[PDB]
Tab-separated table of all heavy atoms in Angstrom:
chain	number	residue	atom	x	y	z
A	85	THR	N	6.821	7.509	-8.640
A	85	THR	CA	6.170	8.449	-7.727
A	85	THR	C	4.850	7.841	-7.264
A	85	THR	O	4.408	6.857	-7.855
A	85	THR	CB	5.882	9.779	-8.394
A	85	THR	OG1	4.918	9.598	-9.408
A	85	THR	CG2	7.135	10.418	-8.991
A	86	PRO	N	4.158	8.508	-6.301
A	86	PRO	CA	2.830	7.975	-6.014
A	86	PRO	C	1.856	8.039	-7.167
A	86	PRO	O	1.020	7.112	-7.264
A	86	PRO	CB	2.356	8.811	-4.813
A	86	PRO	CG	3.684	9.126	-4.092
A	86	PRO	CD	4.582	9.413	-5.208
A	87	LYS	N	2.041	8.984	-8.077
A	87	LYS	CA	1.231	9.091	-9.268
A	87	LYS	C	1.533	7.957	-10.217
A	87	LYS	O	0.664	7.338	-10.727
A	87	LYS	CB	1.468	10.426	-9.930
A	87	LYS	CG	0.738	11.577	-9.263
A	87	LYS	CD	0.937	12.896	-10.006
A	87	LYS	CE	0.363	13.993	-9.178
A	87	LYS	NZ	-1.129	13.933	-9.126
A	88	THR	N	2.831	7.729	-10.521
A	88	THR	CA	3.114	6.666	-11.491
A	88	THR	C	2.935	5.253	-10.956
A	88	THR	O	2.616	4.348	-11.688
A	88	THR	CB	4.440	6.826	-12.188
A	88	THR	OG1	5.529	6.625	-11.250
A	88	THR	CG2	4.583	8.189	-12.857
A	89	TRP	N	3.097	5.063	-9.648
A	89	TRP	CA	2.680	3.917	-8.910
A	89	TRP	C	1.219	3.555	-9.270
A	89	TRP	O	0.938	2.471	-9.670
A	89	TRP	CB	2.849	4.077	-7.462
A	89	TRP	CG	2.160	3.072	-6.588
A	89	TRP	CD1	2.151	1.721	-6.757
A	89	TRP	CD2	1.404	3.304	-5.422
A	89	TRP	NE1	1.427	1.129	-5.759
A	89	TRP	CE2	0.948	2.076	-4.947
A	89	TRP	CE3	1.021	4.492	-4.726
A	89	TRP	CZ2	0.128	1.964	-3.849
A	89	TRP	CZ3	0.251	4.343	-3.590
A	89	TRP	CH2	-0.261	3.134	-3.211
A	90	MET	N	0.356	4.529	-9.062
A	90	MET	CA	-1.066	4.331	-9.342
A	90	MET	C	-1.335	4.067	-10.862
A	90	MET	O	-1.994	3.116	-11.148
A	90	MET	CB	-1.899	5.544	-8.936
A	90	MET	CG	-1.933	5.758	-7.436
A	90	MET	SD	-2.704	4.363	-6.600
A	90	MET	CE	-4.398	4.531	-7.189
A	91	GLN	N	-0.694	4.882	-11.667
A	91	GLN	CA	-0.995	4.787	-13.139
A	91	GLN	C	-0.537	3.450	-13.713
A	91	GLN	O	-1.245	2.925	-14.558
A	91	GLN	CB	-0.210	5.944	-13.825
A	91	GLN	CG	-0.561	6.187	-15.269
A	91	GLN	CD	0.289	7.306	-15.864
A	91	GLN	OE1	1.113	7.911	-15.136
A	91	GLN	NE2	0.185	7.500	-17.187
A	92	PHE	N	0.559	2.921	-13.258
A	92	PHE	CA	1.155	1.726	-13.859
A	92	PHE	C	1.064	0.498	-12.990
A	92	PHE	O	1.633	-0.538	-13.278
A	92	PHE	CB	2.619	2.005	-14.311
A	92	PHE	CG	2.676	3.155	-15.309
A	92	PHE	CD1	3.401	4.308	-14.980
A	92	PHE	CD2	2.105	3.027	-16.535
A	92	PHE	CE1	3.547	5.296	-15.903
A	92	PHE	CE2	2.223	4.040	-17.461
A	92	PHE	CZ	2.896	5.218	-17.117
A	93	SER	N	0.343	0.597	-11.890
A	93	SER	CA	0.080	-0.507	-10.968
A	93	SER	C	1.403	-1.179	-10.656
A	93	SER	O	1.589	-2.379	-10.806
A	93	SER	CB	-0.862	-1.530	-11.476
A	93	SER	OG	-2.132	-0.901	-11.791
A	94	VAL	N	2.307	-0.364	-10.072
A	94	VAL	CA	3.645	-0.904	-9.787
A	94	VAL	C	3.648	-1.767	-8.489
A	94	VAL	O	3.629	-1.247	-7.393
A	94	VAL	CB	4.646	0.253	-9.656
A	94	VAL	CG1	6.066	-0.275	-9.564
A	94	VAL	CG2	4.528	1.198	-10.851
A	95	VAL	N	3.519	-3.069	-8.672
A	95	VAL	CA	3.270	-4.016	-7.571
A	95	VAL	C	4.399	-3.940	-6.579
A	95	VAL	O	4.109	-3.897	-5.318
A	95	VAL	CB	3.149	-5.468	-8.107
A	95	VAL	CG1	3.190	-6.448	-6.979
A	95	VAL	CG2	1.816	-5.539	-8.844
A	96	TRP	N	5.616	-3.733	-6.970
A	96	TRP	CA	6.703	-3.708	-5.954
A	96	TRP	C	6.591	-2.500	-5.022
A	96	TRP	O	7.030	-2.626	-3.864
A	96	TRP	CB	8.097	-3.794	-6.596
A	96	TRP	CG	8.549	-2.600	-7.438
A	96	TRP	CD1	8.626	-2.590	-8.771
A	96	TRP	CD2	9.187	-1.361	-6.972
A	96	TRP	NE1	9.181	-1.401	-9.193
A	96	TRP	CE2	9.506	-0.653	-8.112
A	96	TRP	CE3	9.498	-0.869	-5.715
A	96	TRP	CZ2	10.175	0.576	-8.053
A	96	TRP	CZ3	10.116	0.347	-5.648
A	96	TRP	CH2	10.478	1.075	-6.793
A	97	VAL	N	6.039	-1.398	-5.469
A	97	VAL	CA	5.763	-0.224	-4.658
A	97	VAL	C	4.679	-0.593	-3.647
A	97	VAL	O	4.761	-0.318	-2.488
A	97	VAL	CB	5.357	1.005	-5.511
A	97	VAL	CG1	4.903	2.109	-4.631
A	97	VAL	CG2	6.609	1.462	-6.296
A	98	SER	N	3.637	-1.237	-4.164
A	98	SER	CA	2.552	-1.662	-3.245
A	98	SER	C	3.110	-2.507	-2.122
A	98	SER	O	2.663	-2.382	-0.964
A	98	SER	CB	1.448	-2.431	-4.028
A	98	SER	OG	0.877	-1.544	-4.960
A	99	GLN	N	4.040	-3.420	-2.462
A	99	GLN	CA	4.616	-4.344	-1.488
A	99	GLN	C	5.556	-3.657	-0.529
A	99	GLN	O	5.588	-3.989	0.634
A	99	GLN	CB	5.238	-5.527	-2.203
A	99	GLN	CG	4.308	-6.392	-3.012
A	99	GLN	CD	5.012	-7.305	-3.937
A	99	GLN	OE1	6.059	-6.964	-4.491
A	99	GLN	NE2	4.473	-8.463	-4.140
A	100	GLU	N	6.249	-2.576	-0.996
A	100	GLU	CA	7.066	-1.759	-0.120
A	100	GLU	C	6.174	-1.070	0.893
A	100	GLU	O	6.475	-1.032	2.043
A	100	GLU	CB	7.799	-0.755	-0.967
A	100	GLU	CG	8.926	-0.006	-0.275
A	100	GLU	CD	9.866	0.712	-1.245
A	100	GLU	OE1	10.546	-0.026	-2.024
A	100	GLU	OE2	9.901	1.978	-1.205
A	101	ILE	N	4.990	-0.661	0.446
A	101	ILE	CA	4.079	0.053	1.299
A	101	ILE	C	3.482	-0.875	2.311
A	101	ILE	O	3.394	-0.562	3.523
A	101	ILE	CB	2.988	0.787	0.428
A	101	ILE	CG1	3.691	1.975	-0.243
A	101	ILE	CG2	1.842	1.229	1.287
A	101	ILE	CD1	2.806	2.689	-1.251
A	102	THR	N	3.068	-2.074	1.924
A	102	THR	CA	2.443	-2.944	2.920
A	102	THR	C	3.437	-3.382	3.984
A	102	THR	O	3.122	-3.479	5.168
A	102	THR	CB	1.764	-4.220	2.294
A	102	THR	OG1	2.702	-4.968	1.537
A	102	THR	CG2	0.602	-3.793	1.424
A	103	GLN	N	4.695	-3.593	3.567
A	103	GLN	CA	5.706	-4.035	4.486
A	103	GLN	C	6.011	-2.912	5.535
A	103	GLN	O	6.216	-3.193	6.699
A	103	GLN	CB	6.980	-4.435	3.754
A	103	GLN	CG	6.785	-5.812	3.146
A	103	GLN	CD	7.987	-6.289	2.346
A	103	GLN	OE1	8.482	-7.386	2.555
A	103	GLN	NE2	8.428	-5.508	1.330
A	104	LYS	N	5.916	-1.653	5.080
A	104	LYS	CA	6.110	-0.545	5.954
A	104	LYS	C	4.964	-0.410	6.938
A	104	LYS	O	5.188	-0.169	8.156
A	104	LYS	CB	6.260	0.745	5.213
A	104	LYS	CG	6.430	1.925	6.130
A	104	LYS	CD	7.820	1.961	6.732
A	104	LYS	CE	8.111	3.400	7.223
A	104	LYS	NZ	9.123	3.380	8.279
A	105	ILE	N	3.701	-0.439	6.472
A	105	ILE	CA	2.551	-0.336	7.374
A	105	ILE	C	2.463	-1.500	8.340
A	105	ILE	O	2.115	-1.387	9.481
A	105	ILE	CB	1.225	-0.222	6.607
A	105	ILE	CG1	1.307	1.003	5.732
A	105	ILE	CG2	0.022	-0.187	7.509
A	105	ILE	CD1	0.080	1.277	4.877
A	106	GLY	N	2.594	-2.751	7.812
A	106	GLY	CA	2.557	-3.887	8.649
A	106	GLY	C	1.188	-4.521	8.769
A	106	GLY	O	0.196	-3.795	8.557
A	107	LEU	N	1.130	-5.784	8.996
A	107	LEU	CA	-0.094	-6.579	8.890
A	107	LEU	C	-1.220	-6.060	9.764
A	107	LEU	O	-2.348	-5.918	9.290
A	107	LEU	CB	0.144	-8.038	9.174
A	107	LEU	CG	-1.067	-8.937	9.053
A	107	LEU	CD1	-1.488	-9.002	7.575
A	107	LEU	CD2	-0.808	-10.352	9.550
A	108	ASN	N	-1.015	-5.938	11.071
A	108	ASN	CA	-2.098	-5.568	11.946
A	108	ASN	C	-2.699	-4.201	11.619
A	108	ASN	O	-3.881	-4.054	11.779
A	108	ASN	CB	-1.717	-5.769	13.475
A	108	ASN	CG	-1.540	-7.201	13.770
A	108	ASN	OD1	-2.110	-8.113	13.147
A	108	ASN	ND2	-0.718	-7.426	14.801
A	109	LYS	N	-1.829	-3.248	11.302
A	109	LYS	CA	-2.348	-1.928	10.926
A	109	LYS	C	-3.104	-1.997	9.567
A	109	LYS	O	-4.196	-1.404	9.439
A	109	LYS	CB	-1.174	-0.945	10.789
A	109	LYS	CG	-1.654	0.489	10.565
A	109	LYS	CD	-0.727	1.475	11.385
A	109	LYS	CE	-1.152	2.909	11.114
A	109	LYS	NZ	-0.176	3.915	11.576
A	110	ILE	N	-2.670	-2.808	8.596
A	110	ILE	CA	-3.506	-3.019	7.371
A	110	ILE	C	-4.817	-3.589	7.796
A	110	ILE	O	-5.866	-3.179	7.290
A	110	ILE	CB	-2.746	-3.945	6.403
A	110	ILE	CG1	-1.539	-3.265	5.804
A	110	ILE	CG2	-3.728	-4.364	5.317
A	110	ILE	CD1	-0.667	-4.161	5.059
A	111	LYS	N	-4.844	-4.647	8.590
A	111	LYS	CA	-6.118	-5.204	9.042
A	111	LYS	C	-7.011	-4.194	9.699
A	111	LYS	O	-8.216	-4.265	9.536
A	111	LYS	CB	-5.889	-6.420	9.972
A	111	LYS	CG	-5.348	-7.640	9.203
A	111	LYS	CD	-4.944	-8.735	10.184
A	111	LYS	CE	-4.458	-9.977	9.441
A	111	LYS	NZ	-4.021	-11.045	10.412
A	112	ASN	N	-6.459	-3.262	10.476
A	112	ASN	CA	-7.276	-2.297	11.067
A	112	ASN	C	-7.884	-1.309	10.078
A	112	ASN	O	-9.030	-0.957	10.154
A	112	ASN	CB	-6.417	-1.501	12.116
A	112	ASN	CG	-7.289	-0.552	12.926
A	112	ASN	OD1	-7.213	0.647	12.758
A	112	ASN	ND2	-8.163	-1.159	13.740
A	113	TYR	N	-7.023	-0.887	9.069
A	113	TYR	CA	-7.601	-0.108	7.921
A	113	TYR	C	-8.689	-0.880	7.177
A	113	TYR	O	-9.668	-0.287	6.812
A	113	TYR	CB	-6.483	0.278	7.003
A	113	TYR	CG	-5.656	1.495	7.408
A	113	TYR	CD1	-4.278	1.403	7.639
A	113	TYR	CD2	-6.264	2.730	7.548
A	113	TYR	CE1	-3.500	2.524	7.887
A	113	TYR	CE2	-5.547	3.825	7.920
A	113	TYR	CZ	-4.149	3.765	8.095
A	113	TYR	OH	-3.438	4.910	8.373
A	114	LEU	N	-8.495	-2.142	6.950
A	114	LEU	CA	-9.502	-2.953	6.231
A	114	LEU	C	-10.789	-2.997	6.953
A	114	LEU	O	-11.914	-2.899	6.416
A	114	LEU	CB	-9.040	-4.356	6.003
A	114	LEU	CG	-7.900	-4.580	5.009
A	114	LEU	CD1	-7.470	-6.051	5.012
A	114	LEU	CD2	-8.321	-4.223	3.593
A	115	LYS	N	-10.726	-2.969	8.329
A	115	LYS	CA	-11.952	-3.009	9.149
A	115	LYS	C	-12.605	-1.634	9.105
A	115	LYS	O	-13.834	-1.521	8.910
A	115	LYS	CB	-11.516	-3.365	10.592
A	115	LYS	CG	-12.686	-3.335	11.563
A	115	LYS	CD	-12.372	-3.976	12.857
A	115	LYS	CE	-13.370	-3.682	13.972
A	115	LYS	NZ	-12.673	-2.862	15.046
A	116	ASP	N	-11.791	-0.607	9.183
A	116	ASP	CA	-12.324	0.808	9.090
A	116	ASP	C	-12.913	1.073	7.710
A	116	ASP	O	-13.870	1.870	7.584
A	116	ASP	CB	-11.162	1.796	9.308
A	116	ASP	CG	-10.853	2.029	10.743
A	116	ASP	OD1	-11.552	1.486	11.637
A	116	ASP	OD2	-9.837	2.698	10.987
A	117	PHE	N	-12.361	0.411	6.695
A	117	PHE	CA	-12.877	0.642	5.327
A	117	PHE	C	-14.052	-0.366	5.000
A	117	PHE	O	-14.673	-0.267	3.942
A	117	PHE	CB	-11.793	0.380	4.267
A	117	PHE	CG	-10.626	1.318	4.316
A	117	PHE	CD1	-9.555	1.094	3.442
A	117	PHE	CD2	-10.567	2.447	5.126
A	117	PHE	CE1	-8.472	1.933	3.406
A	117	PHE	CE2	-9.470	3.269	5.136
A	117	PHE	CZ	-8.426	3.008	4.255
């Protein structure tokens, strides 16, 4: 779940998420953050 993802640093979930958002949108978030 999103909770256990966070708790156990489930890297494959993180990678599922980045692939879904996509590079340019991640870059835009990085700039906003």
Side-chain angles (χ1 to χ4, degrees):
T85 66
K87 284 182 188 292
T88 67
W89 168 44
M90 292 300 291
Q91 189 182 0
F92 301 118
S93 302
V94 188
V95 166
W96 69 253
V97 170
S98 299
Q99 296 166 327
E100 192 165 294
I101 289 172
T102 56
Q103 283 178 128
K104 178 76 160 155
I105 300 179
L107 182 67
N108 292 334
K109 188 141 178 193
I110 288 170
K111 287 171 177 181
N112 188 254
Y113 279 121
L114 290 175
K115 177 166 165 246
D116 281 355
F117 295 176

